[PDB]
């Protein structure tokens, strides 16, 4: 029985911090749904890469629950995630069922917006620290990947492989993560 | 006067080894054209990420020349690049005008197919070494990024940031590469 991931893709997402997790998760045999926040239409990412989602979030959310919900990076993408009632509901449900929530770069700021995982140790992109820490609802970490129970966070495009492999390890185990890692030619 | 990059996107491209160079080059202020080998329609990459090109290769090739031609990774993507007469012509022209040619992962095997840069030191994904070395027309390297004159090669998804920054350094210089690198949170 394969694990399933929901990756929520909004306008202004950081395409590296989106594609790396999708691809690495699929290499691990996770069934990944790239769901467009705004619908099924193509999404213009932060550096103008245009990605066609697999489904609208509206449709994808009806096919839950998922073993992980992934919030990609991107400052404007995260702002869109933070403003979405649908995202709020998905994250609240996932938290309530004790399912993994993974967020990278500015992505974790949507956790703050939706009051998810307060009291957790988290990291973000350095430039998003102040936003994440407004109100002191989390404890901040400068680790490249941070995991506190079901809240898994990471810092930037350059930490995306580590972030993705941490998701794989959490879902499918250390051996699968190591097997997927080797052909990537990571340092 | 900004530098310009042509990134040739074929079905089966490795999406990480495509998006990382596009994004990093755009961060460096390079004008990047993501050109679809087969036309302007969306391209299904190796791990099912679907990317909409900026233009068809047919149109993009008429707007050359470019300061760099980039051949992304992906074993099936590289096979498609290797079979294309349009790619052959673009690479031959670029080589003749002493312009940079950058290829990652399986991408360099298209250089072999099109008889580009023979006698150069190159690297590839380890799994593509035998294909690249058929006939002994290159000298092989296990360096993560290899540059021999105008032929710039690299190994895999995990070397994509280094590859992209080497393109940036070649076009826009070391200082710009360092400036672009820092916010990526690379190790
Ligand atoms: Na990483
Ligand atoms: Na790299």
Curated annotation (Swiss-Prot), chains A, B:
<dbReference type="GO" id="GO:0045944">
    <property type="term" value="P:positive regulation of transcription by RNA polymerase II"/>
</dbReference>
<dbReference type="GO" id="GO:1903376">
    <property type="term" value="P:regulation of oxidative stress-induced neuron intrinsic apoptotic signaling pathway"/>
</dbReference>
<dbReference type="GO" id="GO:0036471">
    <property type="term" value="P:cellular response to glyoxal"/>
</dbReference>
<keyword id="KW-0225">Disease variant</keyword>
<dbReference type="GO" id="GO:0044388">
    <property type="term" value="F:small protein activating enzyme binding"/>
</dbReference>
<dbReference type="GO" id="GO:0060765">
    <property type="term" value="P:regulation of androgen receptor signaling pathway"/>
</dbReference>
<keyword id="KW-0186">Copper</keyword>
<feature type="modified residue" description="N-acetylalanine">
    <location>
        <position position="1"/>
    </location>
</feature>
<keyword id="KW-0007">Acetylation</keyword>
<dbReference type="GO" id="GO:0005758">
    <property type="term" value="C:mitochondrial intermembrane space"/>
</dbReference>
<dbReference type="GO" id="GO:0016684">
    <property type="term" value="F:oxidoreductase activity, acting on peroxide as acceptor"/>
</dbReference>
<dbReference type="GO" id="GO:0000785">
    <property type="term" value="C:chromatin"/>
</dbReference>
<keyword id="KW-0908">Parkinsonism</keyword>
<dbReference type="GO" id="GO:0002866">
    <property type="term" value="P:positive regulation of acute inflammatory response to antigenic stimulus"/>
</dbReference>
<dbReference type="GO" id="GO:0010628">
    <property type="term" value="P:positive regulation of gene expression"/>
</dbReference>
<dbReference type="GO" id="GO:0003713">
    <property type="term" value="F:transcription coactivator activity"/>
</dbReference>
<dbReference type="GO" id="GO:0005737">
    <property type="term" value="C:cytoplasm"/>
</dbReference>
<keyword id="KW-0539">Nucleus</keyword>
<keyword id="KW-0072">Autophagy</keyword>
<keyword id="KW-0278">Fertilization</keyword>
<dbReference type="GO" id="GO:0006914">
    <property type="term" value="P:autophagy"/>
</dbReference>
<dbReference type="GO" id="GO:0030424">
    <property type="term" value="C:axon"/>
</dbReference>
<keyword id="KW-0907">Parkinson disease</keyword>
<dbReference type="GO" id="GO:0005912">
    <property type="term" value="C:adherens junction"/>
</dbReference>
<dbReference type="GO" id="GO:0007005">
    <property type="term" value="P:mitochondrion organization"/>
</dbReference>
<dbReference type="GO" id="GO:1902236">
    <property type="term" value="P:negative regulation of endoplasmic reticulum stress-induced intrinsic apoptotic signaling pathway"/>
</dbReference>
<dbReference type="GO" id="GO:0008047">
    <property type="term" value="F:enzyme activator activity"/>
</dbReference>
<dbReference type="GO" id="GO:0051899">
    <property type="term" value="P:membrane depolarization"/>
</dbReference>
<dbReference type="GO" id="GO:1903197">
    <property type="term" value="P:positive regulation of L-dopa biosynthetic process"/>
</dbReference>
<keyword id="KW-0523">Neurodegeneration</keyword>
<dbReference type="GO" id="GO:1903189">
    <property type="term" value="P:glyoxal metabolic process"/>
</dbReference>
<dbReference type="GO" id="GO:0045340">
    <property type="term" value="F:mercury ion binding"/>
</dbReference>
<feature type="modified residue" description="Cysteine sulfinic acid (-SO2H); alternate">
    <location>
        <position position="105"/>
    </location>
</feature>
<dbReference type="GO" id="GO:0019826">
    <property type="term" value="F:oxygen sensor activity"/>
</dbReference>
<dbReference type="GO" id="GO:1902176">
    <property type="term" value="P:negative regulation of oxidative stress-induced intrinsic apoptotic signaling pathway"/>
</dbReference>
<dbReference type="GO" id="GO:0051897">
    <property type="term" value="P:positive regulation of phosphatidylinositol 3-kinase/protein kinase B signal transduction"/>
</dbReference>
<dbReference type="GO" id="GO:0003729">
    <property type="term" value="F:mRNA binding"/>
</dbReference>
<dbReference type="GO" id="GO:0050727">
    <property type="term" value="P:regulation of inflammatory response"/>
</dbReference>
<dbReference type="GO" id="GO:1903377">
    <property type="term" value="P:negative regulation of oxidative stress-induced neuron intrinsic apoptotic signaling pathway"/>
</dbReference>
<dbReference type="GO" id="GO:0005783">
    <property type="term" value="C:endoplasmic reticulum"/>
</dbReference>
<dbReference type="GO" id="GO:0042802">
    <property type="term" value="F:identical protein binding"/>
</dbReference>
<comment type="function">
    <text>Multifunctional protein with controversial molecular function which plays an important role in cell protection against oxidative stress and cell death acting as oxidative stress sensor and redox-sensitive chaperone and protease. It is involved in neuroprotective mechanisms like the stabilization of NFE2L2 and PINK1 proteins, male fertility as a positive regulator of androgen signaling pathway as well as cell growth and transformation through, for instance, the modulation of NF-kappa-B signaling pathway.</text>
</comment>
